[PDB]
Amino acid sequence: ATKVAVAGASGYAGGEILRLLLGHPAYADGRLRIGALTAATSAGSTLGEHHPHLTPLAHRVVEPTEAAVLGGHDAVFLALPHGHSAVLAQQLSPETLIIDCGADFRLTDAAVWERFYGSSHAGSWPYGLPELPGARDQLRGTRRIAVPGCYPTAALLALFPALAADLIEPAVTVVAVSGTSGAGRAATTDLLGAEVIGSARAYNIAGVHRHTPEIAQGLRAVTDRDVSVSFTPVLIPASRGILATCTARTRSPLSQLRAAYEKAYHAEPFIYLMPEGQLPRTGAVIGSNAAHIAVAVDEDAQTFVAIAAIDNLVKGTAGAAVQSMNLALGWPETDGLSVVGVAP
Amino acid sequence: ATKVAVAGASGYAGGEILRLLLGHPAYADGRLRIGALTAATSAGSTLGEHHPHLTPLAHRVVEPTEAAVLGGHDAVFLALPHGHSAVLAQQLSPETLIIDCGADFRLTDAAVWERFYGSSHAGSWPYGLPELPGARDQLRGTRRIAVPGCYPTAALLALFPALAADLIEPAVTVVAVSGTSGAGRAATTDLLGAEVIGSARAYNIAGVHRHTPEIAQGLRAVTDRDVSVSFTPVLIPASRGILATCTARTRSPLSQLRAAYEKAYHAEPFIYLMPEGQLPRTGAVIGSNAAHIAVAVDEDAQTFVAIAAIDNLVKGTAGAAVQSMNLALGWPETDGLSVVGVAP
Amino acid sequence: ATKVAVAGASGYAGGEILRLLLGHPAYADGRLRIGALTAATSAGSTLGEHHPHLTPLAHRVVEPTEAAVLGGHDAVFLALPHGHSAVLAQQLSPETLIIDCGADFRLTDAAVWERFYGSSHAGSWPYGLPELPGARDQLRGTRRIAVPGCYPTAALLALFPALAADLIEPAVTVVAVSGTSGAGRAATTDLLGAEVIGSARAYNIAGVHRHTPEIAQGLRAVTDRDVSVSFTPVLIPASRGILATCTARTRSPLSQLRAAYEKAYHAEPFIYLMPEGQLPRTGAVIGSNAAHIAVAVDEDAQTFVAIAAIDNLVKGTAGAAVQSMNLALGWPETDGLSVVGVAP
Amino acid sequence: ATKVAVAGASGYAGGEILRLLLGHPAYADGRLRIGALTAATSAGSTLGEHHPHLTPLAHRVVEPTEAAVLGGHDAVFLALPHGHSAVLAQQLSPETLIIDCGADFRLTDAAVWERFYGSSHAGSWPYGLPELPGARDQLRGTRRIAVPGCYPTAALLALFPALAADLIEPAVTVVAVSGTSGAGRAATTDLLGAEVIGSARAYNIAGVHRHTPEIAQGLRAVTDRDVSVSFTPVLIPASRGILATCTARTRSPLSQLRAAYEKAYHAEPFIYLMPEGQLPRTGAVIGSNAAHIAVAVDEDAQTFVAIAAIDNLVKGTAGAAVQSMNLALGWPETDGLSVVGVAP
Numbered sequence A, B, C, D: 001a002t003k004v005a006v007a008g009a010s011g012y013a014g015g016e017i018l019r020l021l022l023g024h025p026a027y028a029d030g031r032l033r034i035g036a037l038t039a040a041t042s043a044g045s046t047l048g049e050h051h052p053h054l055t056p057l058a059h060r061v062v063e064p065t066e067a068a069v070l071g072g073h074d075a076v077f078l079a080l081p082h083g084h085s086a087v088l089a090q091q092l093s094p095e096t097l098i099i100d101c102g103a104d105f106r107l108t109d110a111a112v113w114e115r116f117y118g119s120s121h122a123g124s125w126p127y128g129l130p131e132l133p134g135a136r137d138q139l140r141g142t143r144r145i146a147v148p149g150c151y152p153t154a155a156l157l158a159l160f161p162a163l164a165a166d167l168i169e170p171a172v173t174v175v176a177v178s179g180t181s182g183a184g185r186a187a188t189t190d191l192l193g194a195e196v197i198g199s200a201r202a203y204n205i206a207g208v209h210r211h212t213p214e215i216a217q218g219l220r221a222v223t224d225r226d227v228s229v230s231f232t233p234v235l236i237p238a239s240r241g242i243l244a245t246c247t248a249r250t251r252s253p254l255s256q257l258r259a260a261y262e263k264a265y266h267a268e269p270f271i272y273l274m275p276e277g278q279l280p281r282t283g284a285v286i287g288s289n290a291a292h293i294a295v296a297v298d299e300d301a302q303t304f305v306a307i308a309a310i311d312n313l314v315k316g317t318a319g320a321a322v323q324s325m326n327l328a329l330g331w332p333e334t335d336g337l338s339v340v341g342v343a344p
C-alpha cells in the first residue's frame, strides 16, 4: 500500500499525472490510494471544475498546498513553477519519495542555474530519464527524483546515442515544435485560443531558454568534449506535441549511425525506431509514453539529422515522472504506461 | 488593356492569385481583366465549385489547359507549383508575360534540376524575389518570370543580408514550419484533416527536399564561399504560414548583424524588422504579403539565429507572382498587395 | 477630412475596426483620419505589442480612455469591455458620430435589457444591420450607431426573409458554432490554447445567453406573430467565425422560400445565396464582410433549415461598424469592405 | 478463449479497435488473440505504415478482404463502409460472432432503408448501443451485433430518457458538431487539412443524412407516438469528437426532466451526468467511451435542451463495438474501456 499526493494538481502536468494513475494497476488493486490533491490555485473548489476529463475524481476538494496536507504520504508529486519546490522538499519528511516535475533539482552546475533562473541552486536529484545511461540504475529504489523538462527529454533522446558513440561533433542545432499545454496553464493573453490558432511563433530564442543548459548538461555526460546547443523553441497550434529536429555536422556514413540507435535502443520498450524510410509524427505518440525516432545524414552539407516525437505531457512530463516512480518503488517499470497513442 | 489568364486555377495557388487580382486597383479601375481560368482536371465546371470565397467569379466556367485557350492573353499565370510548365510556356507569344509558380524555370545551374527532379532542364527566367539584390532590375519589364518556392522565399529573406556582408558562416541550418496549404490540393491521405489535426511531422529531410538546393542558389548570389544547406520542413495544424528558423555560426556583434539588416530592408516597403524584443508570429502575416523578420546571436553556441514569418500562399507563391508582374508591367510594386495580416 | 478614434483599440474588435480602417479608400486618399487609440488599462504601450498585424500603425502609443482623449474627433469607436460605455458615450459631444460595438444600445424594450444585462437601460440608437429592412434608411446620415452582436447578425440574415414573407412559424431554433475570437481578449483559462484546441462545447444554454433577445427583437421587426427563440451557441477550435443552423416549422414549399430569399438579397452585395446543392462554410467568408446563406427544406419533419456563415469579427462586429459608418458619412456602402474572404 | 480478426484495419474505425484491444485485459491474459487484419487496396503492406500509432502491431501484414482470411476466428470486427458488410456477412460461419461497424444490419424497418441507402435490405442484428432500454439483454450472448453510428449514439443518449417518460414532445431538433475523422479516410478534397482548419461547414442537412432514420428508430423505440428527427451535422476543426445539441418542446418541470435522467443513468458506468453548473465538452471524453450529459429547460421558449458529448471514434464506434463484443463473449462490459478522458 502506497499513499500519494499531487502538489499542483490544479493544472496540466498534475492532472495528467492523476490520469495516468487512475489507469495504473497499483490503484486498480488497492496498492495505491489517491490522497491529497493540492494547489494555491482555487482551493475549495472541486477537482472536476478543473479536469472534466477525470470524473472518477471529480468529487475531491483541493486543499491548500501546505506541509500539513502533504505529510502523511509515502509519495508526493510536485508540479510547480520553479521556486516553490526547494522550500517544500525540506518541510517534508525525507523518508518520502519526492518527484519534482519542476526544474529546482535538475542541473548540477550552480553557476549555470543562477544565470538562467535568477535564484540560488537548491541541489540536484537523479534525472527522471531512465533510457539515458546510468540514469536507470541511480533511479532503482531512489526516494527523490527530478523530472526533465519536456524539450530536453526530446532533445536528449534524439541525440545521445550518436554523441555517446562518437559519431557527430558537439556543436548541435536543435529546433523543436510544441503544443501550448507544455506552456503551462497560467492564463496569459499570448496563450488564448484566438492567438495560437493559426500561428507559429518562436519564443526565448538564441540560447536564452532555461531548457538550453539542460540539453547541454545531459549531452556532456556522454562524451569528453564540451558542448554547445543552438536551441530554438517553436509554439504551434496543438494542445500536445514535441517534434524535435536535431542536426550536427558529421563525417560518418548513415549505415554506421543506424547501428548506434539500434545499439542504444534494442531493449528500450518506450523507444521505437522508424523502419528505414519512415519518420515519427507527434500524433502517433499522443497519450502514449513512446518516443518515435528516426535518423538520416545529409552529405552535401556533412550534416547528420535526428528526429524525435513524444508527448510533451507523457514522456516529457507526467509519463517520465510515473516511469521514474515505477523504478523508485521497484514496481514494474512499464506499469501505467502505454506505447500506443490516441491517434488521430 | 492588359488581360490575364491563370492555369491550374483549381489549385490553392491559382485561387490565391485570383483572389489577389480581384483586389488589384487595376481590376477596380479597369486596366486589367480576369480572362481564361484553366485547369488540368475539373475542366468544365464553375470556379465556385472550387473557391467559395471567389464568389464574384464563382459563375465563370473552367476550360482545360491548352495552347489555344491560354493564347489571346496579354499575360498568363502558370500555377502548378508542382505540375510542370516548361512545355506550355513554350507555346505562347514571347511578348506576352508568363509567370510560372511551378519550379521549372527558377534554376540557373543545371546539374541540380535533374539531380532533384530527374528530367530535362529548361532555363532560368528572372527570379521573382524583388527584395533579393539585383533582382528588381532583372524584373522591371520582363516577359518571363520564375516564382520561388514557399520555403526558399523565407530562408533567403532571413539569411541573405547577413551572408552578403559576410557576417555569418556560409554553412546554414534551416528548420521551417508550414501549414498544409503549401502541399497543394492534391488530395492524399496523409494530408487529411484528422491526420494533420493535433500532429506535426518532418518530410524530405537530409536535404532531400526539392527546395533545398534552391536556397543554395539563392545565397551563392551574395557570397563566393562554399554554401551548404541543412534544411528540414515541418508541417503543422495550420492552413497558411511559414515560420523559418535559420542558424549559422557567427563571430560578429549583434550590433553589426542587426544593422546590416536595417540597412538592407529600411527602404524595402514590404519587409519589416521586428522591434527590439518582439518576435515574428506567422499569424501576423497571414492573408498579406508581409515578411516580418528577427535576428539575434546565440553567444555560448556562437550561432546566429534568424527567423522569418511569411504567408506560404501570398509571398510564398501568389503574392510574389503579383508583386513581380506589377514590376513586369511597371506599376507601383505595392499596388493591390497589403502589409496588414488577417488576424486573429 | 474626418478624424476617427478607437476606444478598446487593443481588443479584438478594436483590432479589426483598425484593420478595416486601414484598407479604406478614404484612408488612402486622406478623407478619413486615424487618431486616438485607447485601451482600458493599457496606457503607454505601443500598438504593435497588442496587434503585430497592424504594422503601419504599430509605432503608436496607447492612451487612456477618458473623455479628455476622445474629444475633437469626428467619429468615435467604442469596442470597450461590453457594459459601461453609455457612460462615456454621453461624455462626448453629441454632433459626433458614435459607433458602439458594445451592447449598451442595441435593445428596444427596457424590460428585456434589465432582465438579461442588469443595469439601468440606456436607450436605443440605430441598430446597425443595413441588410435588415427599414434599418438602412435610419443609418443614413445618423450620428449614433449600435453594432449588432455576432450570433444575431447571422441569425437574422438567415431567418428574417422566410419570416418577412411569413412562410415559417415564429418559433425559431438556433444552434451556432463560432470561433474563439468572439469571446474577446480577456485572458481566461477556458479560452487558452490547450483548452479550446481539439474540443467543442456549448455554453449559456436554454435561452440565457444574452444574444437571444437580440434575435427575437430583430425577428419581431418583420412579423406581428409572437416571436419565440431557442438559441444555443457552441464554441469550437477556430479563431474566427460563425456557422449558424436555423430551424423552424414550415407550411410552404422550398420553391416559395427560395424565391423569397433571392428576392431579398439580390439588391444586397454583401449577402450571397448559395447555388443549389451548396452550403456555406465559414472559411469561405473569413476576413471579408460576406454572408453565405442556404435554404433547404426537411419534409419528413415539417421544418425549414437556413444556414448562414459569417465572420464573427467583420460582419458580426467590425465590418458592420464601417458599413454603417459609410452610410452615415455619406460615403458608398460597400466602401472599404470586401466579399473576398481569405481561404484556405 | 477467443481470437479475433479485423476487416478494414487501414481505416480509423479499424484503427481504433486495434488500439482498444491491445488495451483489453483479456489480451494481456491470453484469452484474447489478434488474428487477421484485412483491407482492400493496401493489402500486402505493413499496418504500421497505416497506423504509426499502433507500434505493438506495426509489423503485421494487411491481408486482402476475403472469407478465408477471416475464416477461422471467433470474432470479426468489420470496419468496412456501407453495403460491404452484407455480402461479406454471408461468407463467415454463422457460428462466428460478427461485429459490423456499418449501416447494413442497423435499421429494423425495410421501407426506409431502401429509400435512404438505395440497396437491398439485409436484416437487423441487435443494436450495440447497450445503454438503451432492453438492448443490453439483446446482446448478452449474441453472435451478431450492429454498431450504432456516431450521431445516433449521442442523439439517442441525450434524448431517450426524456421521450421514454413522455416529458418531451416527439418532435426533436438535433444539431451536432463533429471531428472530421467522422467521415473515415476517403481522401477527397473537402476533408483535406487546409480545407477543414479555420472553417466550419454544415453538411447533408435537412434529413438527407443517413443517420436521421437511425436516430428516429431507437428514438421511436421508447415512446408511444411517432417521432420526427430534424437532424443537422456540422464538421468542425478536430479529429475526434461529437457535441450533440438536442432540442424538443415540453411543458414539464426541469426537476422532473432531471430525475428522469438521474434514474436512467446513475446505473450506467459509461454515461456521465454533469454536476449542477457544468456542461459537457468533447475534449473531456476524448479517448474514452464515456458520454457526458447535461439538460436544461428554456422556460421562456418552453423548449427542452439535452446536451451530450462523446468520442465518435470510441463511444460512437470502436468502444461501443468492443463494449458489445465484451457482452457477446460474456465478459465485463467495462474491460479495456475507460471512462477517464485524455485532456487536453
Ligand SMILES: Nc1ccc(Oc2ccccc2)nc1
Residues within 6 Å of the ligand: C008, C010, C011, C012, C013, C014, C079, C080, C081, C082, C101, C150, C181, C182, C183, C184, C185, C186, C312, C313, C316, C317
Ligand atoms: N464579436 C466581438 C468580439 C469582441 C468584442 O469586444 C472585445 C474584444 C476584445 C477584448 C474586449 C472586448 N465585441 C464583439
